[PDB]
Amino acid sequence: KHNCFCIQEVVSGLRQPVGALHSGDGSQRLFILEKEGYVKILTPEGEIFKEPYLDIHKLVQSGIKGGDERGLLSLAFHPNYKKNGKLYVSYTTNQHDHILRVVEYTVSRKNPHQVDLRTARVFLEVAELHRKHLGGQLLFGPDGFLYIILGDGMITLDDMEEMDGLSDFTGSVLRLDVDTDMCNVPYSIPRSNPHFNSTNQPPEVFAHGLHDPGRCAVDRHNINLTILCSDSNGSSARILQIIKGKDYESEPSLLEFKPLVGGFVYRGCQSERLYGSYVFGDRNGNFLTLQQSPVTKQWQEKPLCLGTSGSCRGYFSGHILGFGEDELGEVYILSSSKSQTHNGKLYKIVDPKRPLMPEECRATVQPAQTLTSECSRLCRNGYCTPTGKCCCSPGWEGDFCRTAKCEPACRHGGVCVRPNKCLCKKGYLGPQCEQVD
Ligand SMILES: O=S(=O)(O)OC[C@H]1O[C@@](COS(=O)(=O)O)(O[C@H]2O[C@H](COS(=O)(=O)O)[C@@H](OS(=O)(=O)O)[C@H](OS(=O)(=O)O)[C@H]2OS(=O)(=O)O)[C@@H](OS(=O)(=O)O)[C@@H]1OS(=O)(=O)O
Ligand SMILES: O=S(=O)(O)OC[C@H]1O[C@@](COS(=O)(=O)O)(O[C@H]2O[C@H](COS(=O)(=O)O)[C@@H](OS(=O)(=O)O)[C@H](OS(=O)(=O)O)[C@H]2OS(=O)(=O)O)[C@@H](OS(=O)(=O)O)[C@@H]1OS(=O)(=O)O
Ligand SMILES: [Ca+2]
């Protein structure tokens, strides 16, 4: 047993952590998601900032029982967050049982370590009848589009035919183009989408037929895009390769051998031998590798063992709640135990055959800077699209929505100050300064 990997505790004191990811800005911050509705920052020196990066625990409806999937579900940073400060979160909230929101946020202009809560911009609201099979994973592909993985919500045919106003998004991989200059809608539909300009099915839907998906593995590489998801109907533990336009109802898995939390594609630097592997794990820490045959394109699973090497250990506390990836590509376990309140932990996966810092893995921290995009500076009245288009609130216009509109116009030298509000010169009265005193 010389081929094993091992697990290194990085931080503890977390409250039900569900995942972790970086923001791609060079700062090597790791953002840890906590189920009740928090996002904490872990610095590359290993400190957790006191102030959460994002606190939406009052907006978030979370569940005390473990099988209750309600809470904060996923987070994705825009590929160009370093310049536009855009991020996307999915979470459950109250309004029949609850609503699954996908919302855009922008980091604050003054503080690169805190989101501006005022910049919430709702993209989707998906009705939910039950508290399982939710999904919620947000991710960006090499194409630059935003993918959204939704489970079936345990919604039956009778539930949907009877109750109108159910979203029809449940059970689907949605693909959005968030880089729009259009102001009438929060996102535009990619033309590559299979139901683009098609009245029969929602244009957002990229694929469907998902039931209870885990965290899906996303490969970056060099042809197109590969997304592998675990799914368990309810036992029925299958793994699916996501392709455009496919219906995965009664679809076999890539594997017959053999519930899984999810998986990841290792693109880190610390392990050479693991580079490019698809890895999936269950809640108890049993891990497997998926290898595709270049010849047949069939998939095969092999076990991946953990073993102790010094303080890099072959075991960890509690159950795996989620996975993480840092800006260097290394991967993490998020686990929690019952016990006290904050018994959640962040662990790193380590290849003990290799140094912790091989020469080629060195990378200089570029500390996070405040936004400098022209839009964020000057877009006073309205919101900025991820492209930098300043979208005016009603009653405003100009390149950055600085000039208010007055219809009819202010008279006698009056100034249009706010929408349809005229500041009159002394001696002139009325809503447009039209009456002479
Ligand atoms: O089936 S699983 O192995 O994936 O387990 C997940 C289910 O755990 C439940 C019910 O499990 S059961 O009692 O064994 O039928 O939650 C409650 O029980 C488990 C028992 O764990 S065990 O390893 O499956 O035996 C508790 O976990 S444990 O800490 O005792 O290991 C649950 O706590 S938790 O899942 O760790 O958060 C316990 O709930 S509670 O935290 O004590 O309140 C179901 O989850 S629950 O209903 O949300 O509590 C899960 O099954 S479900 O069908 O998805 O509901
Ligand atoms: O321990 S549980 O079996 O309760 O697992 C927790 C989830 O089970 C529900 C519904 O899930 S399901 O039945 O698997 O589809 O509760 C259901 O199970 C118990 C039976 O207890 S038992 O010992 O596990 O058999 C019922 O309680 S009882 O009245 O039979 O004593 C539940 O009734 S109720 O839903 O609480 O009203 C029964 O629901 S049902 O027969 O399917 O309608 C869920 O409980 S609930 O949602 O709180 O009502 C649990 O899922 S949860 O949504 O995460 O809470
Ligand atoms: Ca999930």
Numbering used by the authors: 213 to 307, 315 to 440, 445 to 457, 461 to 484, 490 to 570, 573 to 670
Reported in the publication:
HHIP is composed of an N-terminal domain (HHIP-N) that shows weak sequence homology to the cysteine-rich domain (CRD) superfamily, typically involved in small molecule-binding. The C-terminal domain of HHIP is composed of a β-propeller and two EGF repeats (HHIP-C).
In summary, our HHIP-C crystal structures in complex with GAG molecules identify two discrete GAG-binding sites on the surface of HHIP-C, which are distinct and non-overlapping with the HhN-binding interface, thus suggesting that both GAG- and HhN-binding can occur simultaneously. To experimentally validate our HHIP-C:GAG complex structures, we generated a HHIP mutant in which 6 positively-charged residues involved in GAG recognition were mutated to glutamate (K277E/R328E/R350E/K569E/R610E/R613E, HHIP-C Glu mutant) and analysed binding to GAGs.
